[PDB]
Amino acid sequence: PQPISRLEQCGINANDVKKLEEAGYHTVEAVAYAPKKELINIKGISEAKADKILTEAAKLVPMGFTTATEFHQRRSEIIQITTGSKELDKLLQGGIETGSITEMFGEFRTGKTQICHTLAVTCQLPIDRGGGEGKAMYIDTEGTFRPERLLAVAERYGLSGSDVLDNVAYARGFNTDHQTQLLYQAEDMMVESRYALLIVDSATALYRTDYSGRGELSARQMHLARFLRMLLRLADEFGVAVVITNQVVAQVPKKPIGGNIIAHASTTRLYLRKGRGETRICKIYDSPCLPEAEAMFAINADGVGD
Amino acid sequence: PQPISRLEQCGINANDVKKLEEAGYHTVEAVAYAPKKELINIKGISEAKADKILTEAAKLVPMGFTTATEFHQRRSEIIQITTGSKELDKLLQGGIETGSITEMFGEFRTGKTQICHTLAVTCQLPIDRGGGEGKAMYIDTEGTFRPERLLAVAERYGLSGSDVLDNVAYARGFNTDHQTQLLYQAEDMMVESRYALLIVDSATALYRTDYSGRGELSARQMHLARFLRMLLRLADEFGVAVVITNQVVAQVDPKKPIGGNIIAHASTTRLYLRKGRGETRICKIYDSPCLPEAEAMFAINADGVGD
Amino acid sequence: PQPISRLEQCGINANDVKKLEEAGYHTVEAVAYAPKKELINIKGISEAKADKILTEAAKLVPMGFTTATEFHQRRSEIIQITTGSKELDKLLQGGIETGSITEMFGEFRTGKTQICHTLAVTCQLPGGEGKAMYIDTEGTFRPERLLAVAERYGLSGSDVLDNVAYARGFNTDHQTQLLYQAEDMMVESRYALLIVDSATALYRTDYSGRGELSARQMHLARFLRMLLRLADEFGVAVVITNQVVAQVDKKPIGGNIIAHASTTRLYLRKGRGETRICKIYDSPCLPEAEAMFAINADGVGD
DNA sequence: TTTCGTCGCCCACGCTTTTTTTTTTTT
Ligand SMILES: Nc1ncnc2c1ncn2[C@@H]1O[C@H](COP(=O)(O)OP(=O)(O)NP(=O)(O)O)[C@@H](O)[C@H]1O
Ligand SMILES: Nc1ncnc2c1ncn2[C@@H]1O[C@H](COP(=O)(O)OP(=O)(O)NP(=O)(O)O)[C@@H](O)[C@H]1O
Ligand SMILES: Nc1ncnc2c1ncn2[C@@H]1O[C@H](COP(=O)(O)OP(=O)(O)NP(=O)(O)O)[C@@H](O)[C@H]1O
Ligand SMILES: [Mg+2]
Numbered sequence A: 001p002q003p004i005s006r007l008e009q010c011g012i013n014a015n016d017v018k019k020l021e022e023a024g025y026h027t028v029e030a031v032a033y034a035p036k037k038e039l040i041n042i043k044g045i046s047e048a049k050a051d052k053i054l055t056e057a058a059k060l061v062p063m064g065f066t067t068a069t070e071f072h073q074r075r076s077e078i079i080q081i082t083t084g085s086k087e088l089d090k091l092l093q094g095g096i097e098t099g100s101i102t103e104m105f106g107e108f109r110t111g112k113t114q115i116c117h118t119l120a121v122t123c124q125l126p127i128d129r130g131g132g133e134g135k136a137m138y139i140d141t142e143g144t145f146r147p148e149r150l151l152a153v154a155e156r157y158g159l160s161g162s163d164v165l166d167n168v169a170y171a172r173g174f175n176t177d178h179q180t181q182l183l184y185q186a187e188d189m190m191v192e193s194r195y196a197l198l199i200v201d202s203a204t205a206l207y208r209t210d211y212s213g214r215g216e217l218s219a220r221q222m223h224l225a226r227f228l229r230m231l232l233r234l235a236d237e238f239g240v241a242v243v244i245t246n247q248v249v250a251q252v253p254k255k256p257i258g259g260n261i262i263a264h265a266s267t268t269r270l271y272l273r274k275g276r277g278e279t280r281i282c283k284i285y286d287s288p289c290l291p292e293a294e295a296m297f298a299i300n301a302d303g304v305g306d
Numbered sequence B: 001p002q003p004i005s006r007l008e009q010c011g012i013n014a015n016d017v018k019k020l021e022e023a024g025y026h027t028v029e030a031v032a033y034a035p036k037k038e039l040i041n042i043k044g045i046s047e048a049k050a051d052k053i054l055t056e057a058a059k060l061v062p063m064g065f066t067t068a069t070e071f072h073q074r075r076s077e078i079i080q081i082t083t084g085s086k087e088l089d090k091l092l093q094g095g096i097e098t099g100s101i102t103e104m105f106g107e108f109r110t111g112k113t114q115i116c117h118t119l120a121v122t123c124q125l126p127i128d129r130g131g132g133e134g135k136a137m138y139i140d141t142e143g144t145f146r147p148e149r150l151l152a153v154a155e156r157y158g159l160s161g162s163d164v165l166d167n168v169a170y171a172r173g174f175n176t177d178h179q180t181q182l183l184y185q186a187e188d189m190m191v192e193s194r195y196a197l198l199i200v201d202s203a204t205a206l207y208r209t210d211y212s213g214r215g216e217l218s219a220r221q222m223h224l225a226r227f228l229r230m231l232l233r234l235a236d237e238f239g240v241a242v243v244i245t246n247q248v249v250a251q252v253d254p255k256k257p258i259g260g261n262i263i264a265h266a267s268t269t270r271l272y273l274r275k276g277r278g279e280t281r282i283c284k285i286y287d288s289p290c291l292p293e294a295e296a297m298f299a300i301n302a303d304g305v306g307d
Numbered sequence C: 001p002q003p004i005s006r007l008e009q010c011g012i013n014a015n016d017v018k019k020l021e022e023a024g025y026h027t028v029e030a031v032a033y034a035p036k037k038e039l040i041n042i043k044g045i046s047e048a049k050a051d052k053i054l055t056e057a058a059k060l061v062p063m064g065f066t067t068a069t070e071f072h073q074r075r076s077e078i079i080q081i082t083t084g085s086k087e088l089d090k091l092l093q094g095g096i097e098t099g100s101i102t103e104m105f106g107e108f109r110t111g112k113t114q115i116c117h118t119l120a121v122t123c124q125l126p127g128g129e130g131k132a133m134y135i136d137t138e139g140t141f142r143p144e145r146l147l148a149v150a151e152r153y154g155l156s157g158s159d160v161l162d163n164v165a166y167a168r169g170f171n172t173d174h175q176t177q178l179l180y181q182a183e184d185m186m187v188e189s190r191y192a193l194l195i196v197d198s199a200t201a202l203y204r205t206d207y208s209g210r211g212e213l214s215a216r217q218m219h220l221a222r223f224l225r226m227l228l229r230l231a232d233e234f235g236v237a238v239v240i241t242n243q244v245v246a247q248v249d250k251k252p253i254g255g256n257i258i259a260h261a262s263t264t265r266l267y268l269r270k271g272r273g274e275t276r277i278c279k280i281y282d283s284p285c286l287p288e289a290e291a292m293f294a295i296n297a298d299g300v301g302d
Numbered sequence D: 001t002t003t004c005g006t007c008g009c010c011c012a013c014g015c016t017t018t019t020t021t022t023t024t025t026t027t
């Protein structure tokens, strides 16, 4: 995550760097990942200047066929934040993978928010316990953030109550556009420190409301595609683990409320089901590296256990 | 908290403010909540000055990344409107919470409207009962709004009828769009006043007959979702606690709340009420992000919810 | 009851009013209380006209909210037709509450049906009401019972007891139009109450079959939605009646449809001899108890 | 030293939504 000032020393002046920063490119990776057609619509950058900055950005960010034994080593070195439950972290063959998107969908009262709250504390656990030793981004679009759960999880894990709530940074999206701006601000502020997680609670819930009718289906899917592409860019350029949450719909018998856009974009999906009492069930979905099966986890006072 | 007028103090000419208010944006926070898609939809407001409506309003609200310590400090500010029972209080850990939606569902005679009446009384009461201050907003379609029960509940709490029944409203229109329109109007009603509880009992009772048959289900569910979302906006913007009771359907494949998968997610708290013995009922916390899976027996009496 | 000439003299002056009257939902309260979908299939296709009529006919008793004391006073002067017995002066808190939706069950054709051929004591007494109804789904209405009951009190008149009580209904799709057209004479003259004898008694006589049960339940939901609309708009006390099912797992026909579309339901049981013990059920402001009724050849009371 | 002319050419698809609804007594 090299800051945007890295290319400032090489060619690009301060004015252009400021224009990029106000555009939303707070890192060299964000500039390098964007196409040439996107570094043109932002005023203040010429076409030749755009090609120049693209060349300089590509000088540091690795692209193309370079080496893949190193990438296999990197995949073996994936952080794999643990869920906190012995069956959820085993069904996922380690837990939530980092650098990808882990959508979880269920009917209701299925433990999606409970899992997010547990992960917001477990991402601060060292690699010995399973985590990333970093902060926790919490984009919460339902007003469903209860720090008491985080304190309970921390006291279960024997961590300081003040530390976990100091690490966790919280923001609430009020619409889809504001969700995108919140994502941009998160990208801006994720370079100043290390963030081991990024939670988008009900990543597609305001889409169900803001876009009404069939006439807005294409625009809604395009906006959701842009949002998921931005989330993927955050996942690669930062190495964070994005655990987004999805709702469910009935086939007029359940299916995630996102179309094929979110089905393809989401690297992993989890189907959460209500079991008996406090226990629930989790099933893998659309995971290219995981089998299809079920799990067995419970919602205790200490987040998610068994 | 603050009026819409501040927007025209920032440098937008009053005609644009009146156009924004005509669409329903009776507060600066409300217009900030809506995205640019809902701002371009206002007639006479194009993409021009849209930034002057978005970022100028956003400069007056946080709309950013706080810390969890600050949110936990704000968590003490919550009023936590209190019920009438001590066991029920232990169930909800102090009572229903401020700025959230509680949906209570069950069969007939499960104490729903009694809970609504008692909660509105505690909202029209000092902090000693559990609610800070504010009027009680009623939105009745099922028809159980009998001010006889309001008068009866007023005797136990020792409040004169002049200052309680004149402080509570009523809904006359039995239409799905009527509740949304009346809540948009209650927005401007409450921006000039203070409110603590907002009750919409027939949250999904209207949709059982308004949209009948498979084929019209989708439009019904988009309508319900839009109503729920603007209800959540109203709850958050003014820190009001919302109650929305629900009906049940028997699974013929055994009672399930109606309008599922749309009201299930939106309702941040769900209370499942069962009939017990005599007149006592049992309230179980169906859905909650903080409260456990507990059950509390209460006994509706003349005083109120009772225990 | 607001049959004001404003409904036709407003900005809308065209065939739209006559289309609305012919569609079966007339009077102004058929507009501001009706969804937009109903104003689609009616003859005359204009979505702009829907909101035009809505704007021009939403100017009624406060619909842009109100205060609860304004109609709390209105329901302090409410009729509240007292029951035809002096034993229920403690229970029921007076009489049959007007503007509510009371439900009776426990019997098939006797019992609660007798409670249809009685009461109206407040109607006879002071002015006053002097009005009563009768609807049916599968019933055996007998006006001689009304004659005998009125003769018990000081209401000795004969013709005044007639020309009000409907006595029709055998098949659901037959009395669909009956409950549609009730308003056609309900607004011409003011009116007190409305019993629906054997209402939605056994829909499985015609609306029968698995898979069909859902459509049946939608039909009942529509019917009591209209019934609630009429009860609240005209300020009348409606009495729905059903029959038991003998649970094999003491409940009435209707399931969760009429269960969530009533106000003051109350079970009717059998006592000793002519004693018809009348227990109570869900009610916003009535403590649970059991009443004591009696039926005799003269009528219901004692 | 002199003195302007003269139009042609089409491309190219995107996007799912949404649950309802209880009968029925034997011996
Ligand atoms: N302290 C606690 N102890 C035990 N269980 C709890 C506790 N707090 C919450 N729960 C359980 O967690 C459930 C809610 O889980 P949640 O993660 O909010 O579901 P969800 O699928 O996110 N629902 P929604 O967000 O409305 O779509 C509750 O209904 C309880 O069963
Ligand atoms: N006008 C009336 N006056 C007095 N008694 C009446 C009158 N009408 C009906 N009854 C009584 O009601 C009785 C009906 O039989 P009952 O023993 O109640 O049958 P049930 O099976 O208990 N009732 P149901 O549930 O309607 O089938 C008659 O036989 C009479 O005793
Ligand atoms: N004074 C009282 N004393 C004791 N219990 C009471 C009293 N008033 C009301 N109750 C009880 O509280 C219940 C509240 O029911 P209510 O909340 O009206 O159900 P509902 O689901 O809204 N009705 P419906 O429209 O038929 O589905 C009553 O039915 C009684 O059981
Ligand atoms: Mg959950």
Ligand SMILES: [Mg+2]
Pocket (backbone or CB within 6 Å): B107, B108, B109, B110, B111, B112, B113, B114
């Ligand atoms: Mg109730």
Ligand SMILES: [Mg+2]
Pocket (backbone or CB within 6 Å): C108, C109, C110, C111, C112, C113, C114, C139, C140
């Ligand atoms: Mg009968």
